[PDB]
Design a binder for these strands. Structure first.
Ligand code: MG
Ligand code: MG
Ligand code: MG
Ligand code: MG
Ligand code: MG
Ligand code: MG
Ligand code: MG
Ligand code: MG
Ligand code: MG
Ligand code: MG
Ligand code: MG
Ligand code: MG
Ligand code: MG
Ligand code: MG
Ligand code: MG
Ligand code: MG
Ligand code: MG
Ligand code: MG
Ligand code: MG
Ligand code: MG
Ligand code: MG
Ligand code: MG
Ligand code: MG
Ligand code: MG
Ligand code: MG
Ligand code: MG
Ligand code: MG
Lengths: 81, 122, 213, 121, 50, 155
RNA sequence: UCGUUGCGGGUCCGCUUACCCGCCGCAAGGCGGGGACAGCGGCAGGCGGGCUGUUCGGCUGGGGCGGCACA
RNA sequence: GGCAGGCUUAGAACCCGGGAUCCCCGAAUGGGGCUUCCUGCCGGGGCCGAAUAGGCCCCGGCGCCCCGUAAGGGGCGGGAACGCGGGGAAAGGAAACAUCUUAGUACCCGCAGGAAGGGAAGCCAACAGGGACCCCCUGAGUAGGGGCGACCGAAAGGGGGAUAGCCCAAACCAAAUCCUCGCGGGACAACCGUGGGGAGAUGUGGGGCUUGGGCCCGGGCAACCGCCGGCGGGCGGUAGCCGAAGUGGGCUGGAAUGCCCCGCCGUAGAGGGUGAUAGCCCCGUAGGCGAAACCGCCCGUGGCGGAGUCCCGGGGUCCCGGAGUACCUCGGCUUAGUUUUGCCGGGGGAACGCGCCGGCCACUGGCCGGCAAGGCUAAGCACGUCCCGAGUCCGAUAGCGCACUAGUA
C-alpha cells in the first residue's frame, strides 16, 4: 500500500521534531489502513495519522508514532534517509 | 392476452410547412396491423422469448383483444420440437446426411443392377 | 478504374457569408478558422473540379472478325524482313523469314539449351539488344513500379500449352512465348507497329491453319 | 516474413518495419571459398567474433574482427574500418553486411552449428 | 475554487502532471526533432474545460 | 454424362406458332415410370426430378434409358443424390419486430401477391437501380426524350 | 349517421350489468348519481386566416393610377 | 540517433499459439451520482480498544423484465457498411403553382445475420405447354399510370449463377410421450436400467404433407426415419525453412551497381536494399519443405432410438384437409394496376371437397389451372471496420481533414 517515503526538508523537520514519518500511499487508502500497514510492516505503534491528497493526485500521510519509537531512527533503519 | 385500443393510429398533424397533400389527419392509418402491434408489445413484456403467432379473440367499443403465443428457445422441451426448431435453430452435421445418402445410393444401384437392368436392356 | 475520394474536398463545415464583409463570396470555414476559403476548386483544400471517375470507359471494344483480321495481318507482317527491321529487330543473322524451326525444339527444357538454339538460329543478337537496352525510365513510374523499360526481342510460338520450351525460353529479356491458339495483338505488334521477330515451331505452323480465320 | 508484392512501397515498408527476427536475415554474407569448402554452406548471418573482409568502400581490402552488430540499422562495426573524431576518439564506420565476405567463423555457439547443418542439408 | 470535488481535482492533477515540455535528453535522442509537447499549456492562455 | 431434361417452351399467342425447346427443371414422373423408377430412386441416383410436370417426352425417356443402362452396367458414375445434404436453421430473433410473423407477412402483402409484386420489393428494386445507375435509371426522362426525338426525326 | 348498445313491457315507458361521474379502499371490492343517454372510434355536412401552401399578368418616354395601343 | 544501469548462451529480444494480471466510469446491474466519485443492509474476516461494547477497514451477495417445479437459464450494450419492419418531409422540377414529382428518398423509431430478406403453386399460361426461390442479362422505357404535362413505370417469356426439399394441425390410435435430477452401465456422448420430481386427456406421442392423406386387405426389405460426433486419416490457416550464377581485370570516381574486356545461372531477367545505374553482393523470385498449440474443412469408421412409420398391389366413396379468414362497403396510404395493385382503419361477413379460389369491368355457361387464410429451408446475390493483391491514379497548397508526439493542438 505504501508507495514511498517523503524525504523533503519539511518531512525531515517533522521527523526530527514531532516523531512523524511522511509517506506516499495509494489514493484509496484510509487512515485505518495506513496505521495498520505502518504497524505491521515496521512493528511500531502509531499515535495518529493525518492524510491529504496532493495537487499532483497522490495521497500523503503524516504518521505520528507513539512515544517509544523514533521516526528518524526508523528512517535510518530502512535506509531511505 | 393483449388488450389494445382500436381505430387508426395516432397520426400527428404537422406543425411545420407542408404541401396540402401532406397535411391530412383523419383516415390515415399505419401499414402495421394491431395484431402485429400486440405481438411486439407481448415480446417487449417477455424479453428473450420469441413470438410464434397470434390470433384475434374479441372486440368491444374501444379495445381489441389478441392472444400471442411465445416460446422460450432456451427450454429443452422447446428446442427439440419439430415445429419450434424452425424458430429456435437446428443444425445437422453434413457427414451424417452425406454418409446416409451415399449408402442409400450404393444400395439402390446394387438393387437396380439385379431388378432393372434386364428390363431396361430388353 | 481510377478515381478520387467521392467526398474529397467537400466534408468541411463551410458556408458563403455573402457580401458586405469586404471579402470574396466563396464558401469559407464556419468555425474558428472562419475567413479561410473552402470547398471551391480554386481554394486550397477544395474539391477537384473534374476528377477521374471510376465509371469511365477505358476499354476500346473491337469486333471479333476485325480483331482476327488484324491478327492475320500481323502474322503476315512477321514474314517480311522489312517490317521486322522497321520495328527495330536485328535480323541480319536470321537465315530466312518467315522463321520456322522443327517441332523437336519444343522438348528443350533448359535455358542454356534454348540460348544455344537462339544462337544457332540467329536470334541471340536481338536478345542481346533487349538485354543491353533495358533502361530506367524517366518520370514517376519508378515510384509506382515501372522503373525498368525493357525492349522486345523474340516471340516464340509453340503448338500447345505446357511444352518445356516455354519454361526454357521465358526468362530471356524481351522474349514472349505463347501457344499458337493464344496469339494476340499484344505480342504480335508491340507498340502498335507491325512486324515482330517470331520463331515458329513447325507443329505450331501446322496448327495455325485452322485458327484466326 | 517480407512481402511478396512487386510494389516498391510494399517492399520498402516490409524492409523498414520488419521485426528483429526477420532483420536477422539481412545480415547474411558470402563465405570465402575455403570456408565454403569447409562448411558446405554459401552464406551465414554475420556474428560478433567473426572475421570478415571488406569488399567495397574506402576500407576495401581490410580484414578484421566484427566488434558490434546492430540489428535495427542492419549495420556492423569492423575492426580496422575506423577513424578519429575532432576530439581524438576512435569511431567505427557502419558497414552493411552485404559488402563483406566471411573468412573466419565463430562457431562456439551451439545454435550456429544447427543453422550450418540446416543450410548444408 | 476553495471547495472542490475529488473527480475534478484528479482531472486537474492529470493536467498538472502532463503540462511539461519534452526533456532535453529526449531532444538530444531525437536529434532536435521532438522539441514540443501537445500537452504544454499556460494557465492564463489555454483553459481546461474541467 | 448425366442427361438433362428437354421441355417445350410454352407457345404464346404472341409467337404465332413458332415453338422451341429448352432445358427443363427435371424429369417427369411419367418419364421416370417409363424406365421403372420413382422420384426417390431417381433423386438417389442423382437425376433432377420434377414431380410437378405432366408431360412425357420420348427423347427424355431415351436419354434416361441410355444413361441408366450405363449406370447399371458400371460404365458411368452417378452424381451425388439430388436431396438436401445440409440442414442449417438459424435461431430467429425479433420476428415480430422484423415483420416475419403471419400478421407481418399479410401486411407486407406476401399472402395475396408475389414477392416481386409487393410494394417493398418495388421500393428496394428501384432504389438499387437508381443507386447503381442501371439499365433504365441511368437517364431520367429517357422515355420522353425518346418520344420527342422520334417525333422530330420521323416527321 | 354506423358501432359500442344489453334486458323487459306497450315509436314510448321502465331496469341495470354495459358505459360514464365522484367518494372509501393498497388492492380486492363497497357507496352514491347518471344511464344504454353520454363519452369514444369511423363516415358525412356546416362554421372555420386558429394553422399550412401558394398566386396576386403584360405593355408603359422610370414604376403606379389610368388606357388596351393584349385578338 | 542521449546519459546510466541492466537482461541474455541456465537461450533473451523478436514472431505465432495458449494462459495470468486486468484500476475507476461505462449495458453498469445493491443505492446514488452538480463532478468517472460517494454511500447502504446482510455474511465472513481484520484492526483500535480494558472489552464480547462501540467504532473503523477488507472481501462476497443484493438491477429490471421474464422462462423453469426447483436447480438453473435468457434479454439488455457495441460494430465502417450491408439487411428486415414501421413513422416520414422539404428544397428543387414542372421554366408560376396546388394533383404530381422529388420519394417511400433524407431523416427518425424498432429488430437480425455473417449475409439478410425470398422460397416449394388456391402459380403462369392458353387448349401448346412450363414447373420453389433469389440474384445477373434481356423482355423495356414495351404494356400501362399521369394537371395523359413534367415525368413515372411492370410482368409473363427467353439466356445464365445455383440447385432441395420438407414440417405443424386434422382425419385414425389414446398416455405407448417429453423435461429434470439421484444411482449403475454406456465412445467423457447419444442412449440403456432403475427411482423421485415437472409437463401432459384443454391431448404428450404415433401417423400425415399433391405422386393428398386417414381407413381395410395382401405381398417385399434394396425398409424408412432420427440421435451422438468418439477413433483414425487427409488437407488448409494462424510463426517459419531451403532455394542458381562474379563481387573477376582496368578507368573514372569519396565511394561503383557506371564505362572497356572477360566469365556464369536462368523453372529464377517479378521487385527492393547496398556509399552512383547490380540477373550472378544481400533480401528476395521460379520452385520446394514445414507446427508442440489453437482453429477450420473433407473422408473412413464407430455407438445408439422409433409405434414398419419404407416399397409394390387392390378396396374405398365414409372420414380430415387451417375464419373475423375469403368476400362486400366507406375513408386513407401506396401501386404501372388502369370501372382491375397491396395494405391499414370503421361497418357488414361465407362455404366446405357434392366445397372453395383464379383465368386484366360484372354476371351466366363451357373449358383450363389450383387448394388461401400455419412453419422451415443450403447454394447461387449486398457490404466494407478488417486482411491480401493490383494500378496509363496523387505526389507534401496534390492525395483522406491527418505521409509528422491529427480527429491532435
Ligand atoms: Mg483532510
Ligand atoms: Mg414545393
Ligand atoms: Mg484534396
Ligand atoms: Mg477513349
Ligand atoms: Mg521532371
Ligand atoms: Mg481568461
Ligand atoms: Mg425511370
Ligand atoms: Mg349516444
Ligand atoms: Mg362522433
Ligand atoms: Mg395565410
Ligand atoms: Mg396570373
Ligand atoms: Mg410591367
Ligand atoms: Mg394601367
Ligand atoms: Mg451503479
Ligand atoms: Mg442488439
Ligand atoms: Mg437536387
Ligand atoms: Mg416550379
Ligand atoms: Mg418558387
Ligand atoms: Mg441466406
Ligand atoms: Mg433466412
Ligand atoms: Mg416510384
Ligand atoms: Mg399429439
Ligand atoms: Mg534463404
Ligand atoms: Mg542469392
Ligand atoms: Mg387450406
Ligand atoms: Mg515542394
Ligand atoms: Mg494536405
Amino acid at each position: 500500500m505504501i508507495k514511498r517515503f517523503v524525504i523533503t526538508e519539511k518531512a525531515l523537520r517533522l521527523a526530527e521534531r514531532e516523531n512523524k514519518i511522511t509517506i506516499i500511499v495509494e489514493r484509496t487508502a484510509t487512515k485505518k489502513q495506513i496505521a495498520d500497514e505502518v504497524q505491521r510492516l515496521y512493528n511500531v505503534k502509531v499515535e495518529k495519522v493525518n492524510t491529504l491528497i496532493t495537487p499532483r493526485g497522490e495521497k500523503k500521510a503524516y504518521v505520528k508514532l507513539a512515544e517509544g519509537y523514533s521516526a528518524m531512527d526508523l528512517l535510518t533503519k530502512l535506509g531511505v534517509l | 392476452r393483449v388488450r389494445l385500443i382500436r381505430g387508426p393510429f395516432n397520426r400527428r398533424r404537422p406543425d411545420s410547412g407542408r404541401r396540402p397533400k401532406r397535411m391530412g389527419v383523419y383516415g390515415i392509418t399505419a401499414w402495421k396491423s394491431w395484431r402485429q402491434v400486440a405481438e411486439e408489445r407481448a415480446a417487449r413484456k417477455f424479453p428473450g422469448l420469441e413470438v410464434l403467432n397470434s390470433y384475434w379473440v374479441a372486440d368491444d367499443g374501444i379495445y381489441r383483444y389478441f392472444e400471442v403465443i411465445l416460446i422460450d428457445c432456451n427450454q429443452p422441451t422447446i428446442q427439440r420440437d419439430p415445429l419450434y426448431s424452425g424458430i429456435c435453430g437446428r443444425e445437422v452435421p453434413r457427414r451424417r446426411l452425406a454418409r446416409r445418402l451415399r449408402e442409400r445410393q450404393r444400395k439402390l444401384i446394387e438393387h437396380l443392377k439385379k431388378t432393372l437392368l434386364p428390363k431396361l436392356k430388353g | 478504374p481510377k478515381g478520387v475520394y467521392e467526398g474529397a474536398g467537400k466534408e468541411h463545415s463551410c458556408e458563403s457569408f455573402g457580401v458586405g464583409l469586404g471579402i470574396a463570396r466563396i464558401p469559407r470555414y464556419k468555425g474558428h478558422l472562419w475567413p479561410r476559403g473552402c470547398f471551391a476548386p480554386n481554394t486550397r483544400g477544395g474539391r477537384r473540379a473534374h476528377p477521374p471517375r471510376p465509371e469511365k470507359k477505358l476499354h476500346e471494344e473491337i469486333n471479333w472478325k476485325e480483331k482476327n483480321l488484324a491478327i492475320r495481318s500481323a502474322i503476315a507482317a512477321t514474314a517480311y524482313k522489312s517490317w521486322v527491321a522497321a520495328r527495330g529487330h536485328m535480323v541480319e543473322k536470321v537465315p530466312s523469314l518467315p522463321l520456322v524451326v522443327s517441332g523437336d525444339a519444343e522438348k528443350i527444357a533448359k535455358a542454356k539449351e534454348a540460348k544455344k538454339l537462339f544462337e544457332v538460329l540467329g536470334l541471340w543478337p536481338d536478345v542481346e539488344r533487349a538485354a543491353e537496352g533495358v533502361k530506367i525510365r524517366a518520370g514517376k513510374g519508378k515510384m509506382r513500379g515501372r522503373r525498368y523499360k525493357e525492349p522486345k526481342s523474340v516471340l516464340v510460338v509453340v503448338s500447345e500449352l505446357d511444352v518445356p520450351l516455354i519454361g526454357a525460353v521465358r526468362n530471356f529479356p524481351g522474349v514472349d512465348v505463347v501457344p499458337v491458339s493464344h496469339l494476340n495483338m499484344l505480342v504480335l505488334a508491340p507498340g502498335g507497329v507491325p512486324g515482330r521477330l517470331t520463331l515458329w515451331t513447325a507443329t505450331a505452323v501446322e496448327r495455325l491453319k485452322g485458327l484466326f480465320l | 516474413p517480407f512481402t511478396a508484392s512487386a510494389q516498391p512501397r510494399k517492399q520498402r515498408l516490409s524492409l523498414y518495419a520488419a521485426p528483429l527476427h526477420l532483420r536477422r536475415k539481412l545480415l547474411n554474407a558470402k563465405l570465402s571459398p575455403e570456408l565454403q569448402k569447409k562448411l558446405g554452406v554459401k552464406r551465414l548471418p554475420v556474428r560478433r567474433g567473426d572475421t570478415v573482409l571488406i569488399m567495397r568502400g574506402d576500407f576495401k581490402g581490410v580484414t578484421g574482427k566484427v566488434v558490434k552488430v546492430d540489428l535495427k540499422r542492419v549495420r556492423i562495426f569492423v575492426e580496422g574500418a575506423t577513424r578519429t573524431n575532432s576530439r581524438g576518439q576512435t569511431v567505427y564506420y557502419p558497414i552493411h553486411p552485404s559488402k563483406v565476405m566471411i573468412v573466419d567463423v565463430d562457431l562456439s555457439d551451439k545454435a550456429r552449428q544447427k543453422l550450418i547443418e540446416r543450410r548444408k542439408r | 475554487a476553495r471547495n472542490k470535488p475529488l473527480g475534478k481535482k484528479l482531472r486537474l492533477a492529470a493536467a498538472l502532471n502532463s503540462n511539461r515540455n519534452p526533456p532535453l535528453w529526449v531532444i538530444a535522442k531525437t536529434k532536435r526533432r521532438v522539441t514540443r509537447s501537445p500537452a504544454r499549456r499556460h494557465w492564463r492562455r489555454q483553459k481546461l474545460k474541467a | 454424362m448425366i442427361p438433362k431434361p428437354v421441355v417445350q417452351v410454352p407457345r404464346s399467342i404472341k409467337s404465332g406458332g413458332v415453338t422451341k425447346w429448352k432445358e427443363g427443371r427435371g424429369f417427369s414422373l411419367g418419364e421416370l415410370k417409363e424406365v421403372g423408377l420413382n422420384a426417390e430412386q431417381a433423386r438417389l441416383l442423382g437425376l433432377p426430378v420434377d414431380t410437378r410436370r405432366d408431360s412425357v417426352w420420348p427423347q427424355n425417356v431415351e436419354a434416361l434409358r441410355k444413361w441408366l443402362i450405363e449406370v447399371l452396367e458400371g460404365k458411368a458414375t452417378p452424381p451425388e443424390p439430388t436431396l438436401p445434404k445440409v440442414v442449417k436453421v438459424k435461431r430467429k430473433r425479433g420476428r415480430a419486430f422484423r415483420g416475419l410473423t403471419s400478421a407481418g407477412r399479410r401486411s407486407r402483402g406476401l399472402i395475396s401477391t408475389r414477392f416481386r409484386e409487393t410494394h417493398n420489393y418495388k421500393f428496394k428494386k428501384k432504389a438499387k437501380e437508381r443507386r447503381l445507375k442501371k439499365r433504365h435509371e441511368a437517364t431520367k426522362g429517357l422515355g420522353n426524350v425518346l418520344r420527342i426525338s422520334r417525333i422530330i426525326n420521323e416527321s
